[model samples]
Target chain A: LLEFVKLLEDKKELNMKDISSSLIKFQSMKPNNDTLSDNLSMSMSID
Target chain B: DSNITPFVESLSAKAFVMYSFAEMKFSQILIPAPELKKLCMESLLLYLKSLTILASSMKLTSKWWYENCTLKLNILVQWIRDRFNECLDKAEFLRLKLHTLNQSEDVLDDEPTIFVEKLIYDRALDISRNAARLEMEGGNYNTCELAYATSLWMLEILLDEHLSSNEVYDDGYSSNITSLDESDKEMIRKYVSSIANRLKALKSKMS
Candidate 1:
């Protein structure tokens, strides 16, 4: 899990725009903002 | 052959001790069996002793996402532990009443007693389902994995029970007869199918 987080962080350096685009894409796939917010809250707390 | 006995004994002891601790912890938090609680505590002490001996044999790291994920995981674990304890308490209370009723030679076979027992049983099942759902929602992949494993275990148990029943028994036994009813069977089948489908969906979400 830590390794995956590190991989994503590294990817951000290679292409800053891509990171933002990917975040947007992920958010779009979620059912609603509340679900995304909940997931983000959980991930950010643990990550 | 000489060494094999010791090897098997050692392995079995380890497995037994681990399961004992797991069950004890679960019981202590949920069931509160005094005898089992003491045994669990003793097993835990032994487990710690073993770990101390092997501590230098493995690499250990305290570095985790402590600031972010560790706290959340801790909270989720606590929530599960609380529910387990609550369920055990309720179950124990019901068991005591059942025991008292069984011991009494003269008892009224009235509607109230039957109704209370049925209500308790239903509540127990409801709590179990809710606890499972909470584990799924918590996003703990390990818990989700166990849920799948538990579901498989339940299915295997049902199959075993079905196979154990005789054809004649199914035709005459009250329990079997009720289960065999088309409407009753349909209701059970539908409910179980929905649960299975939901579990599958949860697995996909975890992945």
Candidate 2:
């Protein structure tokens, strides 16, 4: 959430795609199986 | 599709609330062990990050599965459905923990374990307070999201289970079937429309 806090404080311009991309690194920590990773790889392409 | 925009937006909006709440709590504390604060924030970080992942998955375009990856849409919806619930479950669990920690404050002043207990209690209260405040203070969006998530969650349980089972019985509906006969496509379309109506009615009742 520290990362989220930084973005919340630092970035002047705000948009859902940008914030969503930024905060996505914080996705679930549980060891994701192939299903999640494969799906996650797709999310990396969100524009 | 844009139709799911509100559902997609709901998750994204909650992610911000959770992150902001967690951060505020982290700031107002001075604990004996900085490690505890770090550990707590790290845990909160995991919570926030995981939520983002869920939101991202929800935001994907309808054809994303077909174009971006080999994942069958049937299985893909199941994953998204389960993951959204996973998000809900984790959020509830954390809220409970936060509430427990908040409640701990009452007992800590029995001169319990010094700074540790007090800080945890205070910290939990701050986070919990923000969570409640956000929900309570929020206007239409909050209510709509709750309803949307609930409708989706309800539909998910029934539909995802069916899809998961259908995944195994890939006989009749396999997309790999070069060109489904018009009759088969027509049959599939009819079934989908029929169930779509049923689910809409189902959601209406709940709403």
Candidate 3:
């Protein structure tokens, strides 16, 4: 996502070639995985 | 190939569905600690991951996909992620400070304790105020009204009610542990009233 943010900040007209290259690493990522889920929803419990 | 066309069609359809679900989640906002937690955990993170899923799918099929949809999804996701990052950063700071305050012997009288409480109060004000401004900018007047109303309500709490009583009292005498300074109150009041006036102008436009 940080790479996506950088890609967005650095360019107006997006090139798919660049998109494929930059975000290829995330291809192996599973959005439903436990680690990513925990990182997203954990913390700020304040109780 | 023919299989590529079917895959592309399904991918676009799925992408649209994901983006729509995420975009729909922002019809909400702040004023409490649990509510803040809900804002981050239930609402924002859910939609954010939805976009992440969408982005993942888009990246996987980049060789054959809709460029404009990718652009639209990326832009909107970036905007929401900015808000998520802001909320996460601020909430973490508050959590650490609150933890520090809780660990202290004199929770109320301690200096860091007072600072933490004031930070909580200020953050509540900030969340609502910023929501009002952004909702107005996005031309969602009804949603903007709620954000503005919450901002005013929080300001009222700071100025009148909270200073008098904050879930505690002794012999009908209550005092806020972290009082708002007179000048700071005035500054907040200025911005709150300005947004309130802007709300009126928005109402006029609607009529």
Candidate 4:
């Protein structure tokens, strides 16, 4: 995301290639497991 | 992809508006804080900058009569509708997952967080509707200036609302210290710093 933002800041425009690259990077950075779900439950008891 | 499509459509519509005034002379317009902090900021910035230039030029023209205003208003309305659809899709996705998650959990202890998120979402939708109405009224009165101003205000308000909701999420997490292990804290700090850096870069580029 930082790289994506930096690219935007520098280029003043977002091309398809950059957007696709960033999407790939974001997907790569996802946790191996469902950590978000675990974290949500740990933080609050949801009904 | 669905999450980003509306913003793209809005950006494209705004571009169309700019193309309408391609030959007109106007000062550049900058949109501060673009979209929601976590999403849409880039698209929002581009859309607002383009729309502002178009609106500024359209406002100065003798052709700013009812019919022309109506055409522009329709384009904006279409964009807003696309945005609303996107929001609905997101809300629905969240709702489905939340429901499934809720099936296995006890009652929420901190309902305030959920309440605040809901409020933010509703407010965002309301603002969009109100902005569309303003555009409609502006068309009726042939007041493109007022319409554009209202749209800009709506964008600002929506961005603020989103950021406030993000804070609510952050505060909720921070209150539960157990969740913020060293790695989590470090990650969040880095994330926030990156957001700041991005914003600074955007400002420089816009300048």
Candidate 5:
């Protein structure tokens, strides 16, 4: 599990743009101007 | 015999690559909801398949090994499930946004609240049941009681939400279980009774 999560974190770092763009899209879709840090951050922080 | 570690690592790499691919696709805002849902499910399937592969290779040589292996698999599954939940959360958020915007609501018309909740709650029940089994194996009936109690609690909440007259969505969870019918409820009730009997027997055993 630790190994898999480490691999995941590494891959995520290499693809942070993907996640950031997705978060930006979600925020854009919302009708409000609320600044959000998104769910992946919380998930990564837990690791 | 010695190839298991590398074999598992290769499998894990493949699964993570699939997940990363899905995550990349998730960046594009115009993607179809069904496609996104399919991607999320596929990524989970890959990760969980790798986990099963790893578990199947293990030789349970001792009681401690069995216990550790059981919890290890549980923890890995939990890890995969948590990551998939992130992807699915974004998918659901996009679906809701489309609904609110009155654009392409049919993208998730077949799903909406039903399948996602079913996936989460059912997996949660599976986890709890497995942990309870582990506790029972260790003669920790007290711990099993708590595990079973949590299962019953979630099932009760699910049933109550489905049986209620008016639609009242919980904070983050939307409970719409038209998928859960009478026979399903019957099955749920049967399991509840079984859990109750186990609890009863555990109390007697503890005495």
Candidate 6:
């Protein structure tokens, strides 16, 4: 839900209230953030 | 075999004490136990991101034995201490029903009394079984045994909490069952006896 909002939001009219109210929004955003983090680290083995 | 040190075994048992509690409560609020368990496991997975960074930067996993043994131990710690406890809390927070349960709402097939009874039974069983299993796996028996012993010691607290809560009857009949058939008494006895026997099985290794 949060991703859909972020991807499709129009700057002229914001949906901040709806996004803030949904815990499901966190669940949606978390995976994308994790994937981004993992994608960056896959090439480098720090140890 | 976990390298979390011998002193931490009791913490494992305590962690389950909290998890089983969350299981019983959150279930009342229309949240199934499995959902909470899955959410908790996911929280543990997210925790691995930090672990990977730490392992790399600190050389924690440089040794072959460290990755072999410590990886599991790391997951175990977060699984119980962090994920499980936090899941229970989250379930409590997100529950739909705050007070009494409604007939139409999603309640477990068994009554809450019976459901909690099962949790209580398994609580001791898991710790003792875990302790004994660790012993067989070459972990220090003393540590495992203490964990098992601590769980038994904590049993009274759990039982007391249940009894003290508004749920339990005061001194006289807060509840009772009736309408038993004479012919069915035999069946009831067998059922009751099964629970008694099961409890007997839970009191640690056949001592």
TM-score of candidate 6's A chain against the true A chain? 0.38
- In the predicted model 4, the residue pairs found to clash are none
Each candidate: how many clashes? 7, 6, 0, 0, 0, 0
lDDT of 1 by residue, B1-207 (tens): 233334323323332322333333334444334444343333333233223212211111112223222453444334434433543454455445445544553414542222211222233234337546666577575555444434332222222332212222345434332123346335444545655766677778777
Best by lDDT: 5
Candidate topping TM-score? 5
**Runs in model 6 lying further than 4 Å from the true structure:** A1-47, B1-114, B158-207
lDDT of 4 by residue, B1-207 (tens): 233334434444433432222211111221322222212222222233344333333443324334342455556556555544443454344345445545644425544222222332333334334434644554322233333332333233223322212321245545311222456335434533543453354345446
Model 2: per-residue Cα lDDT over B153-183, one tens digit each? 3223222222112111235655211122456
What is every candidate's C-alpha DockQ against the true complex, given to 2 decimals? 0.02, 0.02, 0.03, 0.01, 0.02, 0.02
Cα lDDT for residue B9, candidate 2 = 48
TM-score of structure candidate 6 = 0.29
Q: Runs in model 3 with CA error above 4 Å?
A: A1-47, B1-111, B114-121, B161-178
TM-score of chain B of each: 0.34, 0.28, 0.38, 0.26, 0.39, 0.33
Computed on C-alpha atoms, the DockQ of candidate 1 is 0.02
Candidate-wise lDDT, in order: 0.39, 0.41, 0.46, 0.37, 0.47, 0.41
Off by over 4 Å in 5: A1-47, B1-117, B161-178
Give the 10-residue window scoring lowest on summed lDDT in candidate 2 chain A.
A38-47
Better of 1 and 4 by TM-score: 1
- Model 4 chain B scores worst on lDDT over the 10 consecutive residues at B21-30
Docking class of 5: incorrect
Model 2 chain B: lowest-lDDT 10 consecutive positions: B160-169
Against the hidden true structure, what lDDT does model 1 obtain?
Answer: 0.39
